[PDB]
RNA sequence: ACAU
DNA sequence: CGATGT
């Protein structure tokens, strides 16, 4: 209903899906870019959305921030709640890196705690999430 | 049918 | 038009 401006917004960007994947996190109130992941040669949109949320959790935890996180990805929000990224991407030599990062992100979720609310950014009501890459 |  | 997901 109401945007919680005191929050962190995250999003994936890609070149192809599957394709080159990156993500970033921004201050929802200002749009200041707070973190950016170096592009990963092959991944899916949903793996990147997932990595973005988990990086957000780790970012906020390290700084002792109780801000919520916004993501526009129903899939990734669920994967984080489940602590399991049910990606269909083949595991091969090409996808080894993204799968390592995903597996490690899951491992982090299974060994740490957080109270960070993970909230759905309501794109249909509010427009693109502020971390969007402006490519669509 | 909804979310990317 | 193609793909990733619940
Ligand atoms: K969107
Ligand atoms: Mn997104
Ligand atoms: Mn795993
Ligand atoms: Mn986007
Ligand atoms: Mn367009
Ligand atoms: Mn489009």
């Amino acid at each position: 209903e109401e945007i919680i401006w005191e929050s962190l917004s995250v999003d994936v960007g890609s070149q192809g899906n599957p394709g080159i994947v990156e993500y970033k996190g921004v201050d929802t109130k200002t749009g200041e870019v707070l973190f950016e992941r170096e592009p990963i040669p092959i991944g899916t949109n949903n793996m990147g959305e997932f990595l973005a949320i988990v990086h957000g959790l780790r970012y906020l935890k390290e700084r002792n921030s109780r801000k919520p996180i916004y993501s526009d990805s129903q899939t990734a929000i669920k994967w984080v709640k489940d602590k399991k990224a049910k990606s269909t991407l083949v595991r091969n030599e090409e996808t080894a890196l993204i799968w390592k990062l995903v597996d490690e992100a899951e491992e982090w979720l299974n060994t740490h705690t957080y109270e960070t609310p993970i909230l759905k950014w309501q794109t249909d009501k509010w427009g693109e999430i502020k971390a969007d890459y402006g490519r669509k």
Side-chain angles (χ1 to χ4, degrees), chain A residues 10-12 49 72-73 129:
Chain A
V10 303
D11 200 16
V12 71
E49 295 273 21
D72 60 34
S73 172
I129 197 169

Side-chain angles (χ1 to χ4, degrees), chain A residues 88-92 95 99:
Chain A
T88 70
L89 188 65
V90 63
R91 286 184 185 261
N92 57 32
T95 66
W99 264 118

Side-chain angles (χ1 to χ4, degrees), chain A residues 13-33:
Chain A
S14 83
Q15 300 160 246
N17 185 34
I20 302 171
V21 168
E22 60 201 302
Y23 65 74
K24 64 178 154 170
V26 305
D27 186 316
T28 308
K29 182 154 42 195
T30 66
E32 180 192 356
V33 180

Side-chain angles (χ1 to χ4, degrees), chain A residues 6 9 19 26 33 38 47 51 61 69 71 74 85 88 125:
Chain A
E6 185 176 314
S9 293
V26 305
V33 180
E38 177 179 296
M47 298 169 103
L51 294 175
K61 186 175 183 78
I69 293 171
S71 163
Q74 180 181 309
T88 70
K125 297 180 181 75

Side-chain angles (χ1 to χ4, degrees), chain A residues 83-85 91 99 102-104 106-107:
Chain A
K83 306 189 170 193
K84 171 63 181 189
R91 286 184 185 261
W99 264 118
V102 170
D103 284 335
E104 288 170 349
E106 294 170 335
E107 177 62 30

Side-chain angles (χ1 to χ4, degrees), chain A residues 37-94:
Chain A
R37 166 67 209 200
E38 177 179 296
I40 299 143
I42 300 292
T44 68
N45 62 328
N46 292 324
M47 298 169 103
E49 295 273 21
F50 170 79
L51 294 175
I53 295 172
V54 175
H55 193 79
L57 292 171
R58 300 180 67 171
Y59 175 92
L60 293 174
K61 186 175 183 78
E62 176 82 17
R63 285 157 193 70
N64 295 314
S65 173
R66 289 171 52 79
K67 283 170 187 179
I69 293 171
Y70 276 116
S71 163
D72 60 34
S73 172
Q74 180 181 309
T75 293
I77 292 168
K78 184 178 186 293
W79 285 0
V80 172
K81 182 192 186 183
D82 296 340
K83 306 189 170 193
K84 171 63 181 189
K86 257 178 53 186
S87 175
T88 70
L89 188 65
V90 63
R91 286 184 185 261
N92 57 32
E93 219 167 308
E94 250 55 73

